[PDB]
Structures are given as structure tokens and as C-alpha cells.
Amino acid sequence: AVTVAVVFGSSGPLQTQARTRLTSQNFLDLPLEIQPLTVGVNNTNPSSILTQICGLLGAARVHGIVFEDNVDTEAVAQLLDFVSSQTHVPILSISGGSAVVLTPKEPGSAFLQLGVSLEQQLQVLFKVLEEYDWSAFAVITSLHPGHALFLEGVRAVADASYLSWRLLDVLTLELGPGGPRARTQRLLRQVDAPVLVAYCSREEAEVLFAEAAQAGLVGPGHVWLVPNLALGSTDAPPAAFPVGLISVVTESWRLSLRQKVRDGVAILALGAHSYRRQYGTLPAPAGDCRSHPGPVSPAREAFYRHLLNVTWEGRDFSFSPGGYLVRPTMVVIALNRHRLWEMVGRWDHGVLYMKYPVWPRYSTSLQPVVDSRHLTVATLEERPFVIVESPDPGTGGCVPNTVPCRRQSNHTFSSGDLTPYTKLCCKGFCIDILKKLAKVVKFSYDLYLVTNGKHGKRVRGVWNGMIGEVYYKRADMAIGSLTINEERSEIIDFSVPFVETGISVMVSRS
Amino acid sequence: RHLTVATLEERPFVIVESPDPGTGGCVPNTVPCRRQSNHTFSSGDLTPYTKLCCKGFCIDILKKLAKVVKFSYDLYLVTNGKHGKRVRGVWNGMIGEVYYKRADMAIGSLTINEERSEIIDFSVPFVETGISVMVSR
Amino acid sequence: KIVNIGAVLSTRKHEQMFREAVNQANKRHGSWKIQLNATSVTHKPNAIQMALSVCEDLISSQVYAILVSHPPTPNDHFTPTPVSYTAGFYRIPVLGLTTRMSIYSDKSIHLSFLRTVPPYSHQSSVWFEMMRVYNWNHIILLVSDDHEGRAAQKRLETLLEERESKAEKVLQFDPGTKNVTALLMEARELEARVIILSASEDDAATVYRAAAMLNMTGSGYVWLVGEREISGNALRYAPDGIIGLQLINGKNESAHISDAVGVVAQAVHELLEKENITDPPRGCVGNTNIWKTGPLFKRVLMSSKYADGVTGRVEFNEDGDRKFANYSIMNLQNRKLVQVGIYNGTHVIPNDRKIIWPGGETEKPRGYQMSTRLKIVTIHQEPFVYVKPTMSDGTCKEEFTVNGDPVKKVICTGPNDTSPGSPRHTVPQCCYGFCIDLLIKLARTMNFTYEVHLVADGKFGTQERVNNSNKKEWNGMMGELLSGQADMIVAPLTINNERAQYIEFSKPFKYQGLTILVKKERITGINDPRLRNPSDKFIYATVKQSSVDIYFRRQVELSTMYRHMEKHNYESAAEAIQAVRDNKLHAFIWDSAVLEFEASQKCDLVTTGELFFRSGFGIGMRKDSPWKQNVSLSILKSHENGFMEDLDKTWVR
Numbered sequence A: 001a002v003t004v005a006v007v008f009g010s011s012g013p014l015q016t017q018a019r020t021r022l023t024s025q026n027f028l029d030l031p032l033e034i035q036p037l038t039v040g041v042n043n044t045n046p047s048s049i050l051t052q053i054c055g056l057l058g059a060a061r062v063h064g065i066v067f068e069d070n071v072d073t074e075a076v077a078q079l080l081d082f083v084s085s086q087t088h089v090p091i092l093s094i095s096g097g098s099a100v101v102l103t104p105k106e107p108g109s110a111f112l113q114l115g116v117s118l119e120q121q122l123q124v125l126f127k128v129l130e131e132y133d134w135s136a137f138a139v140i141t142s143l144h145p146g147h148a149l150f151l152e153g154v155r156a157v158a159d160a161s162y163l164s165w166r167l168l169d170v171l172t173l174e175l176g177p178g179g180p181r182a183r184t185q186r187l188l189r190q191v192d193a194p195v196l197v198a199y200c201s202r203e204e205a206e207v208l209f210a211e212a213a214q215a216g217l218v219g220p221g222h223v224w225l226v227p228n229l230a231l232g233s234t235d236a237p238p239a240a241f242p243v244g245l246i247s248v249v250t251e252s253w254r255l256s257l258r259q260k261v262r263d264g265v266a267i268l269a270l271g272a273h274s275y276r277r278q279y280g281t282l283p284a285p286a287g288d289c290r291s292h293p294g295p296v297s298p299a300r301e302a303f304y305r306h307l308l309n310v311t312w313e314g315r316d317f318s319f320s321p322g323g324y325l326v327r328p329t330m331v332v333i334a335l336n337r338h339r340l341w342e343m344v345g346r347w348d349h350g351v352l353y354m355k356y357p358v359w360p361r362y363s364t365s366l367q368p369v370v371d372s373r374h375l376t377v378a379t380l381e382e383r384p385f386v387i388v389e390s391p392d393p394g395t396g397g398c399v400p401n402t403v404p405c406r407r408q409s410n411h412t413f414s415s416g417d418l419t420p421y422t423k424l425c426c427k428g429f430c431i432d433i434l435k436k437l438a439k440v441v442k443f444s445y446d447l448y449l450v451t452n453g454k455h456g457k458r459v460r461g462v463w464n465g466m467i468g469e470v471y472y473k474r475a476d477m478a479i480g481s482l483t484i485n486e487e488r489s490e491i492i493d494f495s496v497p498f499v500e501t502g503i504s505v506m507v508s509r510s
Numbered sequence B: 001r002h003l004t005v006a007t008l009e010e011r012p013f014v015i016v017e018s019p020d021p022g023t024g025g026c027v028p029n030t031v032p033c034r035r036q037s038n039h040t041f042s043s044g045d046l047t048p049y050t051k052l053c054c055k056g057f058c059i060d061i062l063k064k065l066a067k068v069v070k071f072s073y074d075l076y077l078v079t080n081g082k083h084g085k086r087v088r089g090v091w092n093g094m095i096g097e098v099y100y101k102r103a104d105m106a107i108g109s110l111t112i113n114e115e116r117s118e119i120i121d122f123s124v125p126f127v128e129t130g131i132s133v134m135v136s137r
Numbered sequence C: 001k002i003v004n005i006g007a008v009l010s011t012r013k014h015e016q017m018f019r020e021a022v023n024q025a026n027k028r029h030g031s032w033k034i035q036l037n038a039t040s041v042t043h044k045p046n047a048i049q050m051a052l053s054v055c056e057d058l059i060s061s062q063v064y065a066i067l068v069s070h071p072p073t074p075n076d077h078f079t080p081t082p083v084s085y086t087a088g089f090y091r092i093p094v095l096g097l098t099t100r101m102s103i104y105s106d107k108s109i110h111l112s113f114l115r116t117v118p119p120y121s122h123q124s125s126v127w128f129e130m131m132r133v134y135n136w137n138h139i140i141l142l143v144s145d146d147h148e149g150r151a152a153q154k155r156l157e158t159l160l161e162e163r164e165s166k167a168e169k170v171l172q173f174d175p176g177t178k179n180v181t182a183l184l185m186e187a188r189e190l191e192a193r194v195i196i197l198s199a200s201e202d203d204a205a206t207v208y209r210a211a212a213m214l215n216m217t218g219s220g221y222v223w224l225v226g227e228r229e230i231s232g233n234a235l236r237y238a239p240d241g242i243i244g245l246q247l248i249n250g251k252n253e254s255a256h257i258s259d260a261v262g263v264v265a266q267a268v269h270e271l272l273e274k275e276n277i278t279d280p281p282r283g284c285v286g287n288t289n290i291w292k293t294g295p296l297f298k299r300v301l302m303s304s305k306y307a308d309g310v311t312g313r314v315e316f317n318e319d320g321d322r323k324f325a326n327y328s329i330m331n332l333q334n335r336k337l338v339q340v341g342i343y344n345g346t347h348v349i350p351n352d353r354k355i356i357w358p359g360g361e362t363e364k365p366r367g368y369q370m371s372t373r374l375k376i377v378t379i380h381q382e383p384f385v386y387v388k389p390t391m392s393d394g395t396c397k398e399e400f401t402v403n404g405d406p407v408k409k410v411i412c413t414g415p416n417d418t419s420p421g422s423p424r425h426t427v428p429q430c431c432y433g434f435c436i437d438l439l440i441k442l443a444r445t446m447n448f449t450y451e452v453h454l455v456a457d458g459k460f461g462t463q464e465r466v467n468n469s470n471k472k473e474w475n476g477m478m479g480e481l482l483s484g485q486a487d488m489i490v491a492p493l494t495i496n497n498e499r500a501q502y503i504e505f506s507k508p509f510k511y512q513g514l515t516i517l518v519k520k521e522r523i524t525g526i527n528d529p530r531l532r533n534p535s536d537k538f539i540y541a542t543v544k545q546s547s548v549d550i551y552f553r554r555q556v557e558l559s560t561m562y563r564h565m566e567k568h569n570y571e572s573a574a575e576a577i578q579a580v581r582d583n584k585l586h587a588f589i590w591d592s593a594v595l596e597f598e599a600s601q602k603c604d605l606v607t608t609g610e611l612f613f614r615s616g617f618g619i620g621m622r623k624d625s626p627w628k629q630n631v632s633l634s635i636l637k638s639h640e641n642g643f644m645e646d647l648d649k650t651w652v653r
């Protein structure tokens, strides 16, 4: 019967405090039924935290501590780490604020944050970029403490990856209350990139997004990816956040506070169970705020070791030597049209699972129209000019210098009943021309093949093929072996001919 | 990041021209260069240094190197010797300029051999060459 | 407007010096109605009670900044941390006066922390300066595994990257562990003679005694250390002649107190001239918000040049560490720490006395000990390195040239035949040819003996990423040379950009290019329409993991040809040549010299097209090899007089 104490600080509604004392007889499922303790600090300041923890440790002999706090609190993690270093009690930080990973911990501490490192978030985000084939991106960082770690992480992840990443520019902006608003607008006016990866806190994120909207950096053709630091209180996002903003969180993001507390207490109880089963005795409780022993006892070091690797209800809570989570199930979320954070992708066992075959861009910032530098390009397969092939068996994706083209649904047989597309690799003369254009004119594109008709033909008044795709606004432009004639030019606008052609007759000489 | 480069005219590799007085400057693909002279032929302030324009194979190599390694440079020809020769223990030419710290580096029709490589550092040979005999038939 | 400052000091008399300094600052900077007040408390043993007293005594008042000193009793980072947390919650700047740990320079943990004395990591920078003064390039880095050692290693490596150099190797030993001799053994096997140590005093003593037992303190070795390793128990066991360094003031509490009060006073005056300064929280309890001015106060404090200090100019870098400090270089001569220089922030100037190096030498010792035994890896290439079985008695068959001169041969150790039929032992065989004669001349000229062996897997070398790997690694000869199995590559190794980043190349001993070999002359190089339009009818490939593979992989225009070649690449040059003669392979793309020799000697085959990748063969060595210059000079001399022409006539006509 281990004793586990739960500390609070999210405040909120007051009647929920009764729930806190109702936590006594509900852990009956876990082995070795736990003795819970409920204390809530309702101000969360260094003096209050120290006093509450001291009184806790001196009153009853507790085994572990579960701490939850508000999202926006910065320096609470350091205080908990210091307390664990002095009193040698294994703490567990759940919820937010104090679950932001504090990578260098005190040598004797047992903080054990229930969060994910910045490098792991960067790996998941770069996996998303690889999945959607976004090779060119620009990094925007604030002066927030830790931006150097962010830059080191993005460079490390980009270098240790297959695709030839094109980091267009890195600028260290300056956000904050009021501040020097100039020279950030000027810099945000020279950011030419289709994909932007930003690093900032919540308030700095709001300032940055207001500045970017003022600078025309939101809407279709711009994709923003941020780690969890920029988000705060996922339940209600600000009005400045653009739709389609992509972030990566842990699977417990949607869980309630009660479920998080249950998971943390379960981690402590399972660690105690494993330690008792392997040693034959319950772990010794923690000390006090009094004189600290100094050298770490072997019992405390062994209990910590058994507390690291714990699996519970399928999902594992293996903890790094640095105190954060290793190999957790990660959830890629994005802001939809309704301004709600919704799940888009999953990351289990190093394999991405995205729900969208092509990334939707339904932002409504088309007031300048020119802002949408993204194009939807239709095409077909003609052997010399457009060649399609199956993706590379090894790493999926596509072979170098080969644009990824998604065949237009399976509409050949799926009559508007199935969403997903089919990935293929497209190359050839027309595709090389399109790549050159992308670089010259500086636009982004979505290549997809045509399943209704081949090139274009008026069939009882309606057009099919690439001409039909362009005419009925399903595609911004169509490239391929599309001959210019008068009939087609009356309904669409052709470009300068880049390949001479005509009608020719072929015969067998033999 | 500013390198001082020494050179001299050799014809297939370094070609010097006078800029057109009508246009003032000189045509693109031709880097501005100067003579190796101080304020004694100036006779005041009429022309303190001869403003010429250099082009050729080695100048194209230098421009590519500047755009890749990302350095700035000027360019000045050599008037004391041509290529390098240890005269009574004193070096003249490009080897003399580089050895005596007057120029950061020297480019042109500069052959790599042991006597020069002892004194200064050489890059990788970017064009092969050697002793050859020419006869008329 | 009264401004209150706080301090945590040790002797309670340092509090009196603090009050005197604040009075001097309040008089020098016009008092008017600014009234810089000063309050102070003493350090407490229990850290939690120390933090609580920081809340109750200093944070309770309207403190603008807190100064923190270090008690005389050594406790390392334990003592200044609590303050840095409590003041860091509210973004109240805290200035450490004597703390040296590098953990306090990490602004993500200790948010509002500044210091008037640089951390131990900065001792790397002065070390770097010495490496420029005495031209030391090959160094060994012996850092402890604690965070301070990692910071020192990272700082030194970052400094070296700008110079674009590298440490020979880094040896991280666990703090407080005995018998690190095994690690030292590795340092003994390396060619570098310079050791740079970064560890605590007890670890320094352990390392010193272990190195003394292993004769690492003798002549030719150079030891570079910091102040932690030349004080206390470390100084007693320190070997004679080591070079350490000490900060000038360092432990002068009073000078740092005065300087910190001066900088704080200047910053406070500047801040009150800036308006919108709000007010400190006035109490930890109740207040749960940060001080709004805090970040602005810290920004003003960092951008300050107080050029009137007792300890010299007081300026801070991007993370609050004191920039441009003064160090004194100390040499252990006859068990006395004599001062033999001063590092004035940018240079080290020798002033008095004579440096006594660890072996008692009076002259600067070089940082390397180039060996005489050279392990040389080589490959089997037909005109350059013929490999033949040796006779039953274990010696090479005597053989004379067609001209009538003896053929020099060497005893190599190679893997007998391909892997399956091999008995998996390095059998001795006989190696001879162009490269072997070049190596013999080179060894005679440069005065070194050698032992020759063949490459284990018979590949020239390339970078490949095996699945589920954290990084790519070179294979073949390149991997053998980088890993340390070989000291020098004497083989037709092509010089290209990919290999040159990791490997030093000599001046080319043979200029050649790439060409195509065909049976019985109907291909116009790599511009031929059939080459750019692959089909099952026409098959062409090269040797796996060679320079040609690297060349074809790096070209986007040649990508389709690269795929077609990769689908049918061969294992070795001889196998591909035999396949071409056996009508199994249509075109073989390889080196100009080897292919031309094969076509000339074997007949029945012809080379087609012009050379499309002109390069040369060079002797490969490890980066920054001391004798790279000597090898290059010897090769240039051999080219100049007659030796390369003689070799060309003899071996590949």
C-alpha cells in the first residue's frame, strides 16, 4: 500500500476540490491499492510550492508526488526539480506547464517529466514534411530562451534525413509586449517560402501571427508548423492562429485531468509493484526538508530505475535518462475550419499515419488572390513527356528528381464514395518543365493525373480531360501533351508553345 | 573575407584589355584589374593606378571560387618578374608576391613543382600540364 | 524613487563592504532622489531554508537585483542555485560574484542570471590561443563525464570548427571513478602528444597518478589544464612541467562586490531614465506573476560597459558570462607554480621565466610522435598491384624484367579468394607493380619501414546508409584508413570532393580520367543516345562502391543511367572485364589508365569516347597528417626528374 500525494495548481472550479478528496476509493483496479493524498496549492509561487511540499513530506511518509499546473507557468519545473534534488522524492509532472521538458536536470534529481523533448517533436514534424514532400522551408525563431537548441535540432534532423532539404532562411525575430515592432515587419516582408517552421511561446506566437497576417504570410500557399510551446490551452485557441497550423503533441492531449492523474498514479504504483516483486519489499518512503543525506542510497537509485521503464494499458511510459518520455505515441494535430484543434496524423513505432492523402488548404485569405501561390496541376501520361511509375519500395516516397503525383481518387470505379488517392511518381519532359517553372516563378503545386477522358473533348456540350479540369476550375493549370488549337483556345487561355508539334503520318519502311 | 590576388597575362588564361572610355567600365564576364604600381607614374592625381579589365580561363575559375567560397577580392597584375625565380635567394613574380605576404594568393599559369611547393602552399591542380616539345612540319 | 538591492554573502563583513560600495555608488552617481538602498543576508546550510529566506528577506522588499557570493567551504553549484531559482521565477536579475559552473550560463534553466567571472568552459578559449601560438594541431581531450566537462568539450570543438580542425579523440571518464588507466592506454596508442584535461580536483589527481604510472609525463608530452587541476590535492600529485592557468582575481570577493554594485547602479540609473519601470513583486507569497520590467532590466544590464572596475573592464556576452577576462599562465617548475605569461582576453604574452616542459626539455615540443612502422592498405588492380600466391617456403619467387632487372616484391596479407571459399585467414601473398615500386621509393626517401596488407572486402570505398542506422560510414579502403586499420593508402585511389572532406590526398602521381571499354568502337562517350536511353538490350555497369559510383550518384542528369548501372554493377574490375570479354556485359565504365592497359594487353577490346571525368590518383592519408607535405614533395620530385616516366615505361607501356 504505497502512499502517493497529488499536488494541484490548475485552480479552476472549486467544487472539483470535492472530486480531489473523492480520489480515495477509485484505484481499486491497480494492484497494491494506493493511499492517495490531496493537497492543492492555489497560487503556485516558489514560497507556496516549497511550503506545501515541505509540509507534505513532513506530515506523512509519501512515496511519490504527482504535480499538475497551468499551461503558461514557466519556472515551476525548476522548483520541482530542485525539491526532488534536495528531498530525493520521485516527482511526476503531468498536465502542462511543468511538463515542458527541462533537459539538464540536477544529478541527484528524480523529476520525471511526462513530456516529449524538442528533438522528438522536430523529428515528427520533419516526417510530416517528408510525407507531404515539402522540401523547402524557412525557420522563424523568437529570442525565447532555447531557440539555439531549436536551431541545433532542426539542423541535426535535416542533416540526418534522406531528402535534400532546402532551408531557405533562418531569421531570429523579436516578439514580446509592445517591443520594437519595427524590423520584424521588415524581416517578415522578405520571407519567401511555402513552408514556415516557427518557434515561440504562446504570447510571442500571437504577436508573430498578427505580424505575419499584416505581412500577408497566411492563407493558402503558406504552411505553418509549430511545436507544443506555441500552443497553450488547446481547448481554446486564439483568433490570430491561422487555420491549418500544424503541431505535434502526446496522445494524452485530449485526456481529462482526472485521467492524467490516474495515469501518473498508475505509473508510480506499477513502479513500486515491480520494485517490490524484484526486491521482496516495499520501497522506502522519501525524506524531509531537513538535512539531506548527500550520497544517493542504493534503494533510491533502484526504485528510480524500476520507475523508469513502466508499461500501462498497452501504451508504454518508458522514461529517458534525461527524465522525459522515449518512444511515445505522438499525435499530429491541426486547426480546422471551425477553429478547433483536431487530430490529423499518428506516430506509433516510428511510422506515420496521416488522414489526408493531400494536405488541404481551405484558408480564406484569398482577398489578394495572389497570396495563393499554390497551384493544382492536372496532367496525363504520354510516354515521352509524362511517365508515371510506382513509388520506391524501400522508403516509399519517390526517387530523386521525380515529382509525386497522386492519381485522381479511384473515380474510375469509386463513384464519389471514397476519399483516398493513390501515390505515384511522375517524371519526363513536361515534369522537368514544371520543376523549372516552380523555381523561376516561385510557386508551389499539386500534381494529379486525370481519370475522366484523356486530353479534352466536347461531349454533348461538356468537356472532359485536362481541358475539362481547367475549364471547370478543378485545376489551376494543366500541363502535358496538350496541343493548342482554336476550339480549346476559345474557352481557356493557353501559354506560349514550348514544344513544336503538328499532325504527322507514320509508315513502315520495310 | 577580402583576398588580394596576383596574376599576369598569359593569353589563353589571362587576357587584359583597356576599358572603353565611352562606357567608362568594361563588358561583363570581365573582372576589373589593376597594374602593380604605386604613386610615381600618377604624376599627381590624373591616373593613380591603371584600370584594366581581365578575363580568361583562370579569371572564370576565380569568379566561380569567389561565388562558392563566398569571399571578396581585388586583382592586380605583376610587374617584377613573370612567374617566379629564386634570384640570389630572393623570389620575384607571383611566387615572390605570395611568399613575401604582399598578396593573399596568386592565380594564372602557375605550375606546381618542388622548389615552389617548399616555399608556399599549392592547391589541387585544376588543369594538367607539363613539358612539351613543339616542331613545325 | 528609492531603489533597493539585495545580496547573499558569507562572512557578514562582506556585507559591510557591500554597504560601503553601495554608498560609494550612491555618491558617485548623483543621489538626488534615487537613494540606492542595500540589504543583505548570509548563506544558510540547508538549501530549502536558504530559498525560503531569499523569499522572506530579499524578495519581500522591492529588490531590483540580487548579488550572490560563494561560501569558502567548497560546495560547487549547490549554493548559488536556490537564489537563481527564486529570483528567476520573477525575472529578477541575480549576479554571481564567484561562481564558475557552466550550468548557470544556460538561460533556459537559470533565466535571469548574470555573472562577473567567466565559467570554466571559457578556459578552452585560452587553450585555443596556445594552440595557435605553438602550432599544435593533433590534441587529445580528456574531459570528465559531468556537465562541466561536456561544456568544455563542446566549447573547444566549436572553436576548432571555425579553424576547421579536429581533436584526435575525446576520452570521457566517469567522475569519481578509479583506474582510468584503460582510457589513458588509448591516449598512449595515438600519435598525438598533447593532452588537454578538464576534470575536478580528485579526478585530476587520479589521472595524474595513472599517467605517471604509464610514463605519459615524459619528454615530448604536453599537458594543458585549468585551475581546478592545479590546486588542492591535484597540485600535490601534478607531474612536473604541466601548464595550467588561473583567473587573476577569481576569489577576490570584495573587488567583485564593488564591480557588481557599480554595474548595477549604472544599469538602474539607465533603467529609471527609460520610464515605464513598474515595480518588483514585493513578496513571494500572493504574487504569482513575473516582474514586467525584469526582461528589460536584464537587457539593459547585459548591454553595459563599466570600464572603471577594480578587476578591469566589466562587460557581458550573450549569456551573461563576463567577456574579456584576464588569465595568468602557470608552469609547474620544481614543485612551484611559476607565472610564465598572461592571457589578456585575446592574446597570450610571455613576460618572465622559462617554460619547462614535462620531460624537462627547454625547447618547444611538437604535438605528435609519428611512428616508423606504417600499416599500408592496398587493393588488387591489374597494372598497379599484381597479387600472386607465394611459393611453398613462404618467400616470393625471384623474377627478372624483360629488360633484365630484378622486380621488387613485397609480402602482403590478404583474404584468399572470395569469402565463401576462403578459409577466413589473412594468407601471405606476393604484391608487386606500379604502386609497390612507388611505395618502395617513397619509403626509402622518407625513411620509414612498412607492412602491406590487402583491403578486407575488396572495395575502394563509398558512403552508404544501412537501414536503422544513426549515420553513414565509409567502407572499403576509406573505412579502413579512417578507422585506423591503415596509416596510408598506396593504390589507384581517385581524388574527388566526397573523399577529400575526410581524407588528405597527396599531389597526384598519375593523371587520368574515366572511359568506356567495349568488345571488338560504336559509342560516342556518355553522350551517346543509347547510353541516355537505357534498355534491356544494352547493359552497362561499373565496379560497386568506387569513384565512378560516387560520380554517377551525384549527377541529377545522369540519374537514369545511375539506376541502370546500379541494377547490374560488378564486384571488381577483373570480373567486369571478363564479363565484357565473355559477351555478358556490353560496356564497362572505369578508369582511363586501367581500361587502356587492359585493352592494350588483352586485345579483343577497345576504349571508346573521350575522358569525361579527368582526375588523378593520390596517396591517401589521415587528415592533417604531419608527413602529407613530405609525401607530396617526394611525389613532385619523382615526377620532375625521371621516376614516373621510368615506372610508366616499366609497368604500363
Ligand SMILES: *[C@@H]1O[C@H](CO)[C@@H](O[C@@H]2O[C@H](CO)[C@@H](O[C@H]3O[C@H](CO)[C@@H](O)[C@H](O)[C@@H]3O)[C@H](O)[C@H]2NC(C)=O)[C@H](O)[C@H]1NC(C)=O
Residues within 6 Å of the ligand: C251, C252, C253, C254, C255, C310
Ligand atoms: C582584492 O583586490 C583589492 C583591490 O584590487 C584589494 O584591496 C587592496 O588591498 C590592499 C592591501 O592588501 C590595499 O593597499 C593598502 O596597503 C598598501 C601598501 O602600503 C597601500 O599602498 C594602500 O594605500 C593601502 O593602504 C589597497 O588599497 C586595496 N585596494 C582596493 C581598491 O581595495 C583586496 O585586498 C583584494 N582582496 C584579496 C586579495 O583577498
Ligand SMILES: *[C@@H]1O[C@H](CO)[C@@H](O[C@@H]2O[C@H](CO)[C@@H](O[C@H]3O[C@H](CO)[C@@H](O)[C@H](O)[C@@H]3O)[C@H](O)[C@H]2NC(C)=O)[C@H](O)[C@H]1NC(C)=O
Residues within 6 Å of the ligand: C370, C626, C627, C630
Ligand atoms: C620532411 O622532410 C624534412 C626535411 O628532410 C624533415 O625535416 C628534418 O627533420 C629532422 C628531424 O628528424 C631535422 O634534423 C634536426 O633535428 C634532429 C632532431 O631534433 C637533430 O638530431 C638533427 O641533428 C637536426 O638538428 C632536419 O634538420 C629537418 N630538415 C629541415 C630541412 O628542416 C621533416 O622532419 C620531414 N617530415 C616528417 C619526417 O614528418
Ligand SMILES: COC(=O)c1ccc([C@@H]2C(C(C)=O)=C(O)C(=O)N2CCc2c(C)[nH]c3ccccc23)cc1
Residues within 6 Å of the ligand: A133, A134, A135, A136, A137, A166, A192, A193, A194, A195, A373, A435, A436, A438, A439, A442, A443, A444, A445
Ligand atoms: C510546399 O512547397 C514546397 O515544399 C516547395 C519546394 C520547392 C519548390 C521549388 C522547386 C521545385 C522543384 O518545385 C525548387 O527546386 C525550388 O528551389 N523551389 C523553391 C521555390 C520557391 C522559393 C525560392 N520561394 C518560394 C515561396 C513560395 C513558394 C515557392 C517558393 C516549391 C515548393
Ligand SMILES: *[C@@H]1O[C@H](CO)[C@@H](O[C@@H]2O[C@H](CO)[C@@H](O)[C@H](O)[C@H]2NC(C)=O)[C@H](O)[C@H]1NC(C)=O
Residues within 6 Å of the ligand: A274, A278, A302, A305, A306, A309, A310
Ligand atoms: C524495468 O526496469 C528494471 C530495471 O532494469 C527491471 O528490473 C530488473 O529486473 C531483472 C529481472 O527481470 C533483474 O535481473 C535486474 O537486476 C533488475 N534491474 C534492477 C536495476 O534492479 C525491470 O524488470 C523492468 N520491468 C520490466 C517489466 O521489464
Ligand SMILES: *[C@@H]1O[C@H](CO)[C@@H](O[C@@H]2O[C@H](CO)[C@@H](O)[C@H](O)[C@H]2NC(C)=O)[C@H](O)[C@H]1NC(C)=O
Residues within 6 Å of the ligand: C002, C004, C037, C038, C039, C040, C061
Ligand atoms: C533600506 O535597507 C535597510 C537594510 O539596511 C532596510 O532595513 C531593514 O528592514 C527590514 C524590514 O523592515 C528589517 O527586517 C531589517 O532588520 C532592516 N535592516 C536593518 C539593518 O535595519 C530598510 O527597510 C530599507 N528601506 C527601504 C525603504 O527599502
Ligand SMILES: *[C@@H]1O[C@H](CO)[C@@H](O[C@@H]2O[C@H](CO)[C@@H](O)[C@H](O)[C@H]2NC(C)=O)[C@H](O)[C@H]1NC(C)=O
Residues within 6 Å of the ligand: C178, C179, C180, C181, C182
Ligand atoms: C583498473 O583497470 C585496470 C586496467 O583495465 C585493471 O588492470 C588489469 O586487471 C586485469 C584483471 O581484470 C589484469 O589483466 C591485470 O591486473 C590488468 N591488466 C592490464 C592490461 O592492465 C585493474 O585491475 C582495474 N582495477 C583496479 C586497478 O583496482
Ligand SMILES: *[C@@H]1O[C@H](CO)[C@@H](O[C@@H]2O[C@H](CO)[C@@H](O)[C@H](O)[C@H]2NC(C)=O)[C@H](O)[C@H]1NC(C)=O
Residues within 6 Å of the ligand: C311, C312, C313, C324, C325, C326, C344, C345
Ligand atoms: C588585464 O591586465 C592588464 C594589465 O596587465 C590590463 O591592462 C591595463 O588595464 C588598466 C585598466 O583599465 C588600464 O588602465 C591600463 O592602461 C592597461 N594597460 C595596458 C598595457 O593595456 C587589462 O585591462 C586587463 N584586462 C582587462 C580585460 O581589463
Ligand SMILES: *[C@@H]1O[C@H](CO)[C@@H](O[C@@H]2O[C@H](CO)[C@@H](O)[C@H](O)[C@H]2NC(C)=O)[C@H](O)[C@H]1NC(C)=O
Residues within 6 Å of the ligand: C372, C447
Ligand atoms: C632513418 O631511421 C633510422 C631509424 O628510424 C635512423 O636510425 C637511428 O635514428 C635515431 C633517431 O634519432 C638516431 O638517434 C640514431 O643515431 C640512428 N642510428 C644511427 C646508426 O645513426 C636513421 O638515422 C634515419 N636516417 C636518416 C635520418 O637519414
Ligand SMILES: *[C@@H]1O[C@H](CO)[C@@H](O)[C@H](O)[C@H]1NC(C)=O
Residues within 6 Å of the ligand: A040, A041, A042, A043
Ligand atoms: C487559496 O488562496 C488563498 C489566498 O488568497 C489562501 O488564503 C487560501 O488558503 C488558499 N486555499 C487553500 C485551500 O490553500
Ligand SMILES: *[C@@H]1O[C@H](CO)[C@@H](O)[C@H](O)[C@H]1NC(C)=O
Residues within 6 Å of the ligand: A410, A412, A413, A414, A418
Ligand atoms: C479503387 O481504390 C479503392 C480503394 O482501395 C478500392 O476499394 C477499389 O476497388 C479500387 N477500384 C479499382 C481498382 O477499380
Ligand SMILES: *[C@@H]1O[C@H](CO)[C@@H](O)[C@H](O)[C@H]1NC(C)=O
Residues within 6 Å of the ligand: B037, B038, B039, B040
Ligand atoms: C614604386 O614602384 C617603383 C617601380 O616603378 C619601384 O621602383 C618603387 O620602389 C616603388 N615604391 C614603393 C613601393 O614605395
Ligand SMILES: *[C@@H]1O[C@H](CO)[C@@H](O)[C@H](O)[C@H]1NC(C)=O
Residues within 6 Å of the ligand: C213, C214, C215
Ligand atoms: C615506464 O618507465 C619505467 C622506467 O624504467 C619502466 O621501468 C616501465 O616499464 C615503464 N612502463 C611501461 C613501459 O609501461
Ligand SMILES: *[C@@H]1O[C@H](CO)[C@@H](O)[C@H](O)[C@H]1NC(C)=O
Residues within 6 Å of the ligand: A178, C276
Ligand atoms: C508606458 O506605459 C503606458 C501605460 O502602460 C503606455 O500607454 C505607453 O505606451 C508605455 N510606453 C512605452 C511602451 O514606451
Ligand SMILES: *[C@@H]1O[C@H](CO)[C@@H](O)[C@H](O)[C@H]1NC(C)=O
Residues within 6 Å of the ligand: C416, C417, C423, C427
Ligand atoms: C587459397 O585458396 C586456394 C583456392 O584457389 C587453395 O587451393 C589454397 O590451398 C588456399 N591457400 C591456403 C588455404 O593457404
Ligand SMILES: *[C@@H]1O[C@H](CO)[C@@H](O)[C@H](O)[C@H]1NC(C)=O
Residues within 6 Å of the ligand: C467, C468
Ligand atoms: C533492416 O536491417 C536489418 C539488419 O540485418 C535487416 O535484417 C532488416 O531486414 C532490414 N529491414 C528492411 C530492409 O526493411
Ligand SMILES: N[C@@H](CCC(=O)O)C(=O)O
Residues within 6 Å of the ligand: B083, B084, B109, B110, B111, B112
Ligand atoms: N606557369 C609557368 C610559366 C611558363 C612555363 O614554365 O610553362 C611557371 O610556373 O613558371
